[PDB]
Design a protein around this ligand. Structure first.
Ligand SMILES: CCNC(=O)C1CNC1
Ligand SMILES: CCNC(=O)C1CNC1
Length: 330
C-alpha cells in the first residue's frame, strides 16, 4: 500500500503545516500537524475542556462506530516550546492520503495549553518520530507510520514541504519526479527516539564550506533551524544590523535587509536554504525589526533541523531495520 497527502502552511510565514487526516467511521476529518519530532497522535475532541477549544475541529469518539476506549490508558506530553496536552485514549481507524491503519491509538485531549487553544488551525498532532517516545501509559502505543509500515510497498515516508506554498507527505514510496539530482542517505541514531543525524558542515552565502560535524534532529514539527551559537553568529554577522535580542528571544534583523543563503552538508552533498526562507517577518505588527529563521540551540540541548531547513529539500525518512535519512535538492 501507499498514501499521499497534501500539507498546507497554516499562515503566510510557514509557522507550521497541516495535513488532513480521516479518523473514525464515518470519517471525521481533522487537520493535524505531522511532527517527526514526537510520537503521539493526539486530537482536540469532545472531551477537551470547553474553555480550551477556540475554533478547532474536534473528534467525537461516540459518533464513530469503530472507536473503542483503550481502558485505563492516559497520555501527557510536554514539548520543547513549553506547550503541553493530556487526556485518555481510543483506538480507531485512521487514514492519511488513502493509506488506512486500523486500531490506531488516537489520543483524545482533555487538556491543552494556551498556545494550542490559540491556534485555531491545528486540530492536533500526528507524531512520526520513533515509538519509544510515545507517552501513553501504562501500555506504550505505536505511531501511525509504525503501524502502517509492514503494509507499505517500502518502509519509508517522505516530506516535501513548500516555501509559502503547499507540499506533500508520501507513505510507502519515493516519488522520483519530486527532486533533482540524487538522494544522499546518512546514518541515523535512534538512541533519543528522534531522527537524529550528523551534518557534515555549513556555508554562509557564497562563503567557503566549513567542514564540521553537527549532530541534530530532522523535525517537521519545529518551525526554525536551531544550530550551535558559533554557526549562528557566523550567519548573522553577514547581515548588517542583525543582533541577538534577549527581550525578543533571538536574532532579529532589519526588515530592509536581503538575507544570504545558508548551506548545510549531508555527507558530500549540499542543501542550500535560500535567504528568503530565513525571513520570519516583523517581530510585532508594523515593526521594522524582523525575526530570524536561524537561531541558537544553546539553550535547548539539541540542534534542530526544522522546517526552515527541511523545506529546502526532499527528505526521505527510511524506516528499514536500520533507519536512515535521505536528502535531495528540489
Ligand atoms: C516528545 C518531545 N518532542 C518535541 O518536543 C519535538 C519538537 N517537535 C516535537
Ligand atoms: C501540491 C503539492 N506540492 C508540493 O509537493 C511542492 C513541491 N515542493 C512542495
Amino acid at each position: 500500500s501507499t498514501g499521499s497527502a497534501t500539507t498546507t502552511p497554516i499562515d503566510s510565514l510557514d509557522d507550521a503545516y497541516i495535513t488532513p487526516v480521516q479518523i473514525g467511521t464515518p470519517a471525521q476529518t481533522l487537520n493535524l500537524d505531522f511532527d517527526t519530532g514526537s510520537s503521539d497522535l493526539w486530537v482536540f475532541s469532545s472531551e477537551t475542556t470547553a474553555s480550551e477549544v477556540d475554533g478547532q475541529t474536534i473528534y467525537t469518539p461516540s459518533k464513530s462506530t469503530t472507536a473503542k476506549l483503550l481502558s485505563g490508558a492516559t497520555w501527557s506530553i510536554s514539548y520543547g516550546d513549553g506547550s503541553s496536552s493530556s487526556g485518555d485514549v481510543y483506538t480507531d481507524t485512521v487514514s492519511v492520503g488513502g493509506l488506512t491503519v486500523t486500531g490506531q491509538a488516537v489520543e483524545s485531549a482533555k487538556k491543552v495549553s494556551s498556545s494550542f487553544t490559540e491556534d485555531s488551525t491545528i486540530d492536533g498532532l500526528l507524531g512520526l518520530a520513533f515509538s519509544t517516545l510515545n507517552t501513553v501509559s501504562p501500555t506504550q502505543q505505536k505511531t501511525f507510520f509504525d503501524n502502517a509500515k509492514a503494509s507499505l510497498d517500502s518502509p519509508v515516508f517522505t516530506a516535501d514541504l513548500g516555501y509559502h506554498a503547499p507540499g506533500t507527505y508520501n507513505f510507502g514510496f519515493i516519488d522520483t519526479t519530486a527532486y533533482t539530482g540524487s538522494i544522499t542517505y546518512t546514518a541515523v541514531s535512534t538512541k533519543q527516539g528522534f531522527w537524529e543525524w550528523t551534518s557534515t558542515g555549513y556555508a554562509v552565502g557564497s562563503g567557503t564550506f566549513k567542514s564540521t560535524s553537527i549532530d541534530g534532529i530532522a523535525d517537521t514539527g519545529t518551525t526554525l533551524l536551531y544550530l550551535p551559537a558559533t554557526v549562528v553568529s557566523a550567519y548573522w554577522a553577514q547581515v548588517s544590523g542583525a543582533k541577538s535580542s534577549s527581550s525578543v528571544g533571538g536574532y532579529v534583523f532589519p526588515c530592509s535587509a536581503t538575507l544570504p543563503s545558508f548551506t548545510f552538508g549531508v555527507g558530500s552533498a549540499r542543501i542550500v536554504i535560500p535567504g528568503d526562507y530565513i525571513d520570519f517577518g516583523p517581530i510585532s505588527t508594523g515593526s521594522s525589526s524582523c525575526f530570524g529563521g536561524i537561531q541558537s540551540s544553546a539553550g535547548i540541548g539539541i540542534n534542530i533541523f526544522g522546517d526552515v531547513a527541511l523545506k529546502a529539500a526532499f527528505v526521505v525518512f527510511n524506516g528499514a531495520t536500520t533507519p536512515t535519512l535521505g536528502f535531495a535538492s528540489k
